[PDB]
Amino acid sequence: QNVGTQAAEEPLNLPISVCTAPGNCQTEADAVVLDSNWRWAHTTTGYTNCYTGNLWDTTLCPTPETCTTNCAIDGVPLADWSGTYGGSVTGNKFNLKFVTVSTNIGARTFLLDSTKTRYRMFQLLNREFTYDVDVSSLDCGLNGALYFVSMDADGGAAKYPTNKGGAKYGTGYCDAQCPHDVKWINGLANSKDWTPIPGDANSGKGYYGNCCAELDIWEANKQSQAFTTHPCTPNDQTRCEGVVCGDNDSGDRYNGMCDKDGCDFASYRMNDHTFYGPGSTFKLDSTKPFTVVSQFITTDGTDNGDFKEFRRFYVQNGVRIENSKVNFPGITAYDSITDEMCAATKGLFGDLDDHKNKGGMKQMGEAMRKGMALVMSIWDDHDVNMLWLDSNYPPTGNPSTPGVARGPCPTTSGVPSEVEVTQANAVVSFGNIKFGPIGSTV
């Protein structure tokens, strides 16, 4: 995309901590940038929309190349962050409102480095990543997500010279779902064969998808939470078409370059229904804030080893809370993501181990070694109504069959039109982000 001249781009300042030992950290003066999908797209030498509602203008965008020549994405000024997009920062806390009323629904954002010209790339192997979260106002159907993806640090600017904005304009998004709803891919409008998504007034799908590796630290609302590894072959940003995208709609979910299911550790799905929930007698009380700690263990305990284990623990009101465990007869009580856990649990659930097909923890680790961009988002799910996270999936499945039940939400929950009314004022908060060696962040 070209860059428009109507509004300066002003990312929100967000300090994080880089740590060397427990309680010995230094501030890193980073910032938050809005994903290019949420930006106004208009004519390069005017005010005329190139995209309105869920459609590209066919006169301006008869082809992707012409669209890209004629159109530009514009900046987010400071005033518009809260007023239009529902984003705000107080000290080291970042807040994202779900619905902001001209009416904005959801948000996806990235962490910029201290220069505000590149994404802050995190080399996560043999490191610990930690943050405080509040998901108390997110119920069934919503997801306040924090995760990493194998985006380029410059959003693709060096690879795709028609991308003028780079990381500064939140470009280059890709993930392990190979999404077609990304409006700008490889520096070009994804306007070919663009199709609105029914019941989604703001979104559509273009000819291409954009694939890359994804490490989900946090997919969650107050009812259920998960962390998940998604390797791809290769891991780096890859525009896809046809079978390579692994499109759900053509029966290709397991035929593409990315592991779409991922290998998940989701406490409720692993059959501990009392670990996490909205109340003081759950082990971890989702009505109150808490700290989420993630440790990425290698084979030799060094930065050069292969990724072998994703460990997790929590801190809430000064109380250390170890992760829940897998709880099925004849299955080891795993409390972390490893290749063995993935094989054993997917075996039990009858899920295809595409994680293993894509190179497993080792391949996931190669993405983490090269460095990944931090994503913070809030969203509802127009495909599957978040049932995969917090309900029975498939909805018609027996909840006593291992793998089906992922949370207590009813199978009628999560319809975007309903959650966008009922949960309009939901806000996820991510704060006090800390990054360092294992054992350094609490």
mmCIF file of N, CA, C and O in Angstrom, residues 59-129:
data_model
loop_
_atom_site.group_PDB
_atom_site.id
_atom_site.type_symbol
_atom_site.label_atom_id
_atom_site.label_comp_id
_atom_site.label_asym_id
_atom_site.label_seq_id
_atom_site.Cartn_x
_atom_site.Cartn_y
_atom_site.Cartn_z
ATOM 1 N N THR A 59 -14.335 0.617 -9.737
ATOM 2 C CA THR A 59 -13.750 1.565 -10.684
ATOM 3 C C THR A 59 -12.295 1.850 -10.317
ATOM 4 O O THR A 59 -11.437 1.908 -11.188
ATOM 5 N N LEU A 60 -12.021 2.034 -9.030
ATOM 6 C CA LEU A 60 -10.652 2.287 -8.568
ATOM 7 C C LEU A 60 -9.794 1.028 -8.484
ATOM 8 O O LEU A 60 -8.562 1.103 -8.615
ATOM 9 N N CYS A 61 -10.437 -0.121 -8.266
ATOM 10 C CA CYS A 61 -9.734 -1.377 -8.014
ATOM 11 C C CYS A 61 -10.211 -2.519 -8.924
ATOM 12 O O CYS A 61 -10.594 -3.590 -8.434
ATOM 13 N N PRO A 62 -10.160 -2.312 -10.259
ATOM 14 C CA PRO A 62 -10.541 -3.382 -11.187
ATOM 15 C C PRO A 62 -9.550 -4.547 -11.160
ATOM 16 O O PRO A 62 -9.935 -5.684 -11.437
ATOM 17 N N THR A 63 -8.288 -4.252 -10.842
ATOM 18 C CA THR A 63 -7.280 -5.270 -10.570
ATOM 19 C C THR A 63 -6.516 -4.863 -9.313
ATOM 20 O O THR A 63 -6.534 -3.682 -8.942
ATOM 21 N N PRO A 64 -5.850 -5.829 -8.651
ATOM 22 C CA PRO A 64 -5.005 -5.492 -7.497
ATOM 23 C C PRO A 64 -3.941 -4.427 -7.790
ATOM 24 O O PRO A 64 -3.708 -3.542 -6.966
ATOM 25 N N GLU A 65 -3.334 -4.519 -8.967
ATOM 26 C CA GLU A 65 -2.233 -3.641 -9.373
ATOM 27 C C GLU A 65 -2.738 -2.212 -9.542
ATOM 28 O O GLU A 65 -2.118 -1.268 -9.053
ATOM 29 N N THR A 66 -3.877 -2.065 -10.216
ATOM 30 C CA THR A 66 -4.525 -0.761 -10.393
ATOM 31 C C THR A 66 -5.004 -0.183 -9.059
ATOM 32 O O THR A 66 -4.809 1.005 -8.780
ATOM 33 N N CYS A 67 -5.621 -1.037 -8.243
ATOM 34 C CA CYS A 67 -6.043 -0.673 -6.888
ATOM 35 C C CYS A 67 -4.867 -0.102 -6.094
ATOM 36 O O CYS A 67 -4.985 0.944 -5.449
ATOM 37 N N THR A 68 -3.736 -0.792 -6.163
ATOM 38 C CA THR A 68 -2.550 -0.416 -5.403
ATOM 39 C C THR A 68 -1.973 0.917 -5.894
ATOM 40 O O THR A 68 -1.548 1.746 -5.092
ATOM 41 N N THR A 69 -1.991 1.127 -7.205
ATOM 42 C CA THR A 69 -1.572 2.403 -7.781
ATOM 43 C C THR A 69 -2.490 3.552 -7.352
ATOM 44 O O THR A 69 -2.008 4.622 -6.997
ATOM 45 N N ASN A 70 -3.799 3.316 -7.362
ATOM 46 C CA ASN A 70 -4.784 4.378 -7.119
ATOM 47 C C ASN A 70 -5.012 4.719 -5.653
ATOM 48 O O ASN A 70 -5.510 5.800 -5.361
ATOM 49 N N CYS A 71 -4.657 3.811 -4.744
ATOM 50 C CA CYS A 71 -5.130 3.876 -3.362
ATOM 51 C C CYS A 71 -4.004 3.978 -2.345
ATOM 52 O O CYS A 71 -2.848 3.678 -2.640
ATOM 53 N N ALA A 72 -4.368 4.407 -1.138
ATOM 54 C CA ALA A 72 -3.424 4.542 -0.036
ATOM 55 C C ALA A 72 -4.129 4.314 1.301
ATOM 56 O O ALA A 72 -5.327 4.590 1.434
ATOM 57 N N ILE A 73 -3.364 3.830 2.276
ATOM 58 C CA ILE A 73 -3.831 3.679 3.664
ATOM 59 C C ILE A 73 -3.331 4.867 4.478
ATOM 60 O O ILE A 73 -2.232 5.378 4.225
ATOM 61 N N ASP A 74 -4.122 5.322 5.441
ATOM 62 C CA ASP A 74 -3.775 6.542 6.157
ATOM 63 C C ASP A 74 -3.471 6.287 7.628
ATOM 64 O O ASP A 74 -3.612 5.163 8.128
ATOM 65 N N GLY A 75 -3.009 7.330 8.306
ATOM 66 C CA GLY A 75 -2.501 7.205 9.657
ATOM 67 C C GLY A 75 -3.601 7.225 10.694
ATOM 68 O O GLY A 75 -4.730 7.633 10.414
ATOM 69 N N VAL A 76 -3.245 6.776 11.894
ATOM 70 C CA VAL A 76 -4.106 6.864 13.062
ATOM 71 C C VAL A 76 -3.540 7.957 13.975
ATOM 72 O O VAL A 76 -2.498 7.757 14.598
ATOM 73 N N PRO A 77 -4.213 9.115 14.051
ATOM 74 C CA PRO A 77 -3.779 10.125 15.025
ATOM 75 C C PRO A 77 -4.176 9.748 16.447
ATOM 76 O O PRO A 77 -5.087 8.934 16.640
ATOM 77 N N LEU A 78 -3.483 10.339 17.421
ATOM 78 C CA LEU A 78 -3.674 10.006 18.835
ATOM 79 C C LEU A 78 -5.128 10.085 19.283
ATOM 80 O O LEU A 78 -5.604 9.173 19.955
ATOM 81 N N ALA A 79 -5.830 11.149 18.894
ATOM 82 C CA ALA A 79 -7.247 11.335 19.254
ATOM 83 C C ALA A 79 -8.151 10.195 18.774
ATOM 84 O O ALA A 79 -9.104 9.819 19.461
ATOM 85 N N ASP A 80 -7.842 9.649 17.602
ATOM 86 C CA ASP A 80 -8.646 8.579 17.014
ATOM 87 C C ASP A 80 -8.454 7.218 17.673
ATOM 88 O O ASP A 80 -9.306 6.347 17.512
ATOM 89 N N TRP A 81 -7.349 7.017 18.388
ATOM 90 C CA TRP A 81 -7.087 5.723 19.036
ATOM 91 C C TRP A 81 -8.226 5.311 19.975
ATOM 92 O O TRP A 81 -8.775 4.219 19.844
ATOM 93 N N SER A 82 -8.581 6.200 20.889
ATOM 94 C CA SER A 82 -9.673 5.958 21.830
ATOM 95 C C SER A 82 -11.032 6.206 21.172
ATOM 96 O O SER A 82 -11.908 5.353 21.231
ATOM 97 N N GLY A 83 -11.190 7.369 20.541
ATOM 98 C CA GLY A 83 -12.462 7.785 19.937
ATOM 99 C C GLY A 83 -13.009 6.884 18.839
ATOM 100 O O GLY A 83 -14.219 6.674 18.753
ATOM 101 N N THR A 84 -12.118 6.358 18.003
ATOM 102 C CA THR A 84 -12.492 5.533 16.857
ATOM 103 C C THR A 84 -12.198 4.041 17.068
ATOM 104 O O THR A 84 -13.044 3.198 16.759
ATOM 105 N N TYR A 85 -11.014 3.719 17.590
ATOM 106 C CA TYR A 85 -10.534 2.335 17.623
ATOM 107 C C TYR A 85 -10.591 1.631 18.975
ATOM 108 O O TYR A 85 -10.368 0.423 19.038
ATOM 109 N N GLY A 86 -10.904 2.371 20.032
ATOM 110 C CA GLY A 86 -11.031 1.803 21.367
ATOM 111 C C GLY A 86 -9.731 1.404 22.036
ATOM 112 O O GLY A 86 -9.752 0.613 22.978
ATOM 113 N N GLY A 87 -8.609 1.942 21.554
ATOM 114 C CA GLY A 87 -7.294 1.682 22.138
ATOM 115 C C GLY A 87 -6.839 2.814 23.040
ATOM 116 O O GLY A 87 -7.007 3.987 22.707
ATOM 117 N N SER A 88 -6.262 2.458 24.185
ATOM 118 C CA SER A 88 -5.690 3.433 25.106
ATOM 119 C C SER A 88 -4.579 2.805 25.930
ATOM 120 O O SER A 88 -4.538 1.574 26.114
ATOM 121 N N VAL A 89 -3.685 3.659 26.419
ATOM 122 C CA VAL A 89 -2.604 3.245 27.310
ATOM 123 C C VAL A 89 -2.617 4.111 28.564
ATOM 124 O O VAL A 89 -2.802 5.324 28.484
ATOM 125 N N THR A 90 -2.450 3.463 29.717
ATOM 126 C CA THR A 90 -2.199 4.133 30.996
ATOM 127 C C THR A 90 -0.946 3.495 31.577
ATOM 128 O O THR A 90 -0.972 2.320 31.958
ATOM 129 N N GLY A 91 0.148 4.255 31.616
ATOM 130 C CA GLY A 91 1.437 3.749 32.088
ATOM 131 C C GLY A 91 1.898 2.573 31.239
ATOM 132 O O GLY A 91 2.082 2.715 30.039
ATOM 133 N N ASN A 92 2.031 1.400 31.856
ATOM 134 C CA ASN A 92 2.448 0.194 31.135
ATOM 135 C C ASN A 92 1.285 -0.751 30.786
ATOM 136 O O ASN A 92 1.529 -1.900 30.430
ATOM 137 N N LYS A 93 0.044 -0.259 30.892
ATOM 138 C CA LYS A 93 -1.165 -1.030 30.602
ATOM 139 C C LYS A 93 -1.792 -0.570 29.291
ATOM 140 O O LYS A 93 -1.981 0.628 29.080
ATOM 141 N N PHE A 94 -2.122 -1.529 28.431
ATOM 142 C CA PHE A 94 -2.775 -1.279 27.146
ATOM 143 C C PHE A 94 -4.192 -1.863 27.196
ATOM 144 O O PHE A 94 -4.367 -3.028 27.565
ATOM 145 N N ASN A 95 -5.183 -1.052 26.832
ATOM 146 C CA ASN A 95 -6.595 -1.449 26.853
ATOM 147 C C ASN A 95 -7.175 -1.430 25.452
ATOM 148 O O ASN A 95 -6.970 -0.460 24.721
ATOM 149 N N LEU A 96 -7.908 -2.490 25.098
ATOM 150 C CA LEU A 96 -8.606 -2.590 23.815
ATOM 151 C C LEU A 96 -10.091 -2.879 24.023
ATOM 152 O O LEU A 96 -10.458 -3.967 24.493
ATOM 153 N N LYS A 97 -10.918 -1.896 23.661
ATOM 154 C CA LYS A 97 -12.371 -1.991 23.707
ATOM 155 C C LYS A 97 -12.856 -2.755 22.482
ATOM 156 O O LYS A 97 -12.354 -2.544 21.377
ATOM 157 N N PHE A 98 -13.852 -3.617 22.675
ATOM 158 C CA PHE A 98 -14.358 -4.458 21.587
ATOM 159 C C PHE A 98 -15.136 -3.657 20.524
ATOM 160 O O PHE A 98 -14.814 -3.728 19.346
ATOM 161 N N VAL A 99 -16.151 -2.915 20.955
ATOM 162 C CA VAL A 99 -16.963 -2.082 20.063
ATOM 163 C C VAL A 99 -16.777 -0.615 20.441
ATOM 164 O O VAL A 99 -16.963 -0.244 21.595
ATOM 165 N N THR A 100 -16.415 0.210 19.461
ATOM 166 C CA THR A 100 -16.250 1.654 19.668
ATOM 167 C C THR A 100 -17.119 2.435 18.679
ATOM 168 O O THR A 100 -16.881 2.402 17.469
ATOM 169 N N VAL A 101 -18.126 3.131 19.221
ATOM 170 C CA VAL A 101 -19.045 3.985 18.448
ATOM 171 C C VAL A 101 -18.635 5.447 18.663
ATOM 172 O O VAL A 101 -17.891 6.015 17.855
ATOM 173 N N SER A 102 -17.741 4.578 11.486
ATOM 174 C CA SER A 102 -18.153 5.266 12.698
ATOM 175 C C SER A 102 -18.391 4.283 13.859
ATOM 176 O O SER A 102 -18.303 4.683 15.021
ATOM 177 N N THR A 103 -18.710 3.018 13.551
ATOM 178 C CA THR A 103 -18.680 1.933 14.546
ATOM 179 C C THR A 103 -17.589 0.917 14.205
ATOM 180 O O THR A 103 -17.637 0.281 13.153
ATOM 181 N N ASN A 104 -16.630 0.758 15.121
ATOM 182 C CA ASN A 104 -15.501 -0.145 14.937
ATOM 183 C C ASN A 104 -15.662 -1.398 15.801
ATOM 184 O O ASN A 104 -15.996 -1.300 16.979
ATOM 185 N N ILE A 105 -15.411 -2.562 15.205
ATOM 186 C CA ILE A 105 -15.631 -3.854 15.851
ATOM 187 C C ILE A 105 -14.318 -4.624 15.870
ATOM 188 O O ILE A 105 -13.772 -4.967 14.822
ATOM 189 N N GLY A 106 -13.817 -4.878 17.075
ATOM 190 C CA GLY A 106 -12.551 -5.555 17.258
ATOM 191 C C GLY A 106 -11.351 -4.703 16.875
ATOM 192 O O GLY A 106 -11.485 -3.578 16.396
ATOM 193 N N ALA A 107 -10.170 -5.261 17.105
ATOM 194 C CA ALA A 107 -8.921 -4.572 16.810
ATOM 195 C C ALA A 107 -7.802 -5.572 16.842
ATOM 196 O O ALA A 107 -7.848 -6.535 17.614
ATOM 197 N N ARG A 108 -6.811 -5.342 15.991
ATOM 198 C CA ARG A 108 -5.559 -6.078 16.016
ATOM 199 C C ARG A 108 -4.429 -5.062 15.965
ATOM 200 O O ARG A 108 -4.467 -4.106 15.168
ATOM 201 N N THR A 109 -3.439 -5.264 16.832
ATOM 202 C CA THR A 109 -2.351 -4.317 17.005
ATOM 203 C C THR A 109 -1.028 -5.046 17.179
ATOM 204 O O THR A 109 -1.009 -6.212 17.572
ATOM 205 N N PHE A 110 0.064 -4.335 16.905
ATOM 206 C CA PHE A 110 1.411 -4.896 16.984
ATOM 207 C C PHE A 110 2.320 -4.025 17.821
ATOM 208 O O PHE A 110 2.138 -2.807 17.879
ATOM 209 N N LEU A 111 3.321 -4.648 18.435
ATOM 210 C CA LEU A 111 4.327 -3.898 19.187
ATOM 211 C C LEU A 111 5.465 -3.426 18.280
ATOM 212 O O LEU A 111 6.156 -4.239 17.646
ATOM 213 N N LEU A 112 5.649 -2.109 18.228
ATOM 214 C CA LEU A 112 6.796 -1.488 17.573
ATOM 215 C C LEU A 112 7.958 -1.390 18.546
ATOM 216 O O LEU A 112 7.754 -1.300 19.758
ATOM 217 N N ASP A 113 9.171 -1.368 18.003
ATOM 218 C CA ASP A 113 10.373 -1.115 18.788
ATOM 219 C C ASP A 113 10.504 0.381 19.133
ATOM 220 O O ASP A 113 9.656 1.200 18.751
ATOM 221 N N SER A 114 11.584 0.737 19.827
ATOM 222 C CA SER A 114 11.768 2.102 20.315
ATOM 223 C C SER A 114 11.953 3.149 19.221
ATOM 224 O O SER A 114 11.747 4.333 19.483
ATOM 225 N N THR A 115 12.341 2.727 18.013
ATOM 226 C CA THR A 115 12.448 3.644 16.871
ATOM 227 C C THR A 115 11.082 3.972 16.259
ATOM 228 O O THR A 115 10.976 4.931 15.500
ATOM 229 N N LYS A 116 10.070 3.148 16.548
ATOM 230 C CA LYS A 116 8.722 3.254 15.975
ATOM 231 C C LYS A 116 8.670 3.064 14.443
ATOM 232 O O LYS A 116 7.704 3.472 13.793
ATOM 233 N N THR A 117 9.700 2.422 13.885
ATOM 234 C CA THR A 117 9.786 2.128 12.449
ATOM 235 C C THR A 117 9.862 0.628 12.115
ATOM 236 O O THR A 117 9.830 0.263 10.938
ATOM 237 N N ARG A 118 9.986 -0.234 13.128
ATOM 238 C CA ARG A 118 10.028 -1.684 12.934
ATOM 239 C C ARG A 118 9.272 -2.345 14.067
ATOM 240 O O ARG A 118 9.203 -1.804 15.173
ATOM 241 N N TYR A 119 8.708 -3.520 13.807
ATOM 242 C CA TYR A 119 8.139 -4.309 14.884
ATOM 243 C C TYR A 119 9.257 -4.728 15.841
ATOM 244 O O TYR A 119 10.396 -4.989 15.413
ATOM 245 N N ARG A 120 8.932 -4.758 17.131
ATOM 246 C CA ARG A 120 9.846 -5.274 18.145
ATOM 247 C C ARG A 120 9.856 -6.796 17.985
ATOM 248 O O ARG A 120 8.887 -7.463 18.299
ATOM 249 N N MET A 121 10.954 -7.332 17.472
ATOM 250 C CA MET A 121 11.053 -8.764 17.228
ATOM 251 C C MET A 121 11.562 -9.441 18.491
ATOM 252 O O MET A 121 12.547 -8.994 19.095
ATOM 253 N N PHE A 122 10.870 -10.499 18.903
ATOM 254 C CA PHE A 122 11.229 -11.249 20.103
ATOM 255 C C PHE A 122 11.824 -12.587 19.686
ATOM 256 O O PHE A 122 11.157 -13.390 19.039
ATOM 257 N N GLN A 123 13.081 -12.806 20.056
ATOM 258 C CA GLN A 123 13.736 -14.098 19.921
ATOM 259 C C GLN A 123 13.457 -14.856 21.208
ATOM 260 O O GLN A 123 14.065 -14.598 22.239
ATOM 261 N N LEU A 124 12.519 -15.791 21.140
ATOM 262 C CA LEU A 124 11.870 -16.347 22.329
ATOM 263 C C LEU A 124 12.481 -17.636 22.879
ATOM 264 O O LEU A 124 12.133 -18.027 23.996
ATOM 265 N N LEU A 125 13.364 -18.304 22.122
ATOM 266 C CA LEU A 125 13.944 -19.553 22.602
ATOM 267 C C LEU A 125 14.814 -19.302 23.819
ATOM 268 O O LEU A 125 15.623 -18.367 23.818
ATOM 269 N N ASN A 126 14.642 -20.153 24.837
ATOM 270 C CA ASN A 126 15.375 -20.053 26.101
ATOM 271 C C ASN A 126 15.105 -18.729 26.825
ATOM 272 O O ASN A 126 15.983 -18.176 27.491
ATOM 273 N N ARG A 127 13.883 -18.226 26.687
ATOM 274 C CA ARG A 127 13.479 -16.971 27.312
ATOM 275 C C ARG A 127 12.135 -17.158 27.975
ATOM 276 O O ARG A 127 11.461 -18.178 27.787
ATOM 277 N N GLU A 128 11.760 -16.143 28.741
ATOM 278 C CA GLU A 128 10.511 -16.092 29.471
ATOM 279 C C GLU A 128 9.811 -14.810 29.061
ATOM 280 O O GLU A 128 10.452 -13.758 29.028
ATOM 281 N N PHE A 129 8.518 -14.911 28.734
ATOM 282 C CA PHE A 129 7.694 -13.773 28.361
ATOM 283 C C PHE A 129 6.494 -13.747 29.294
ATOM 284 O O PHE A 129 5.818 -14.758 29.451
#
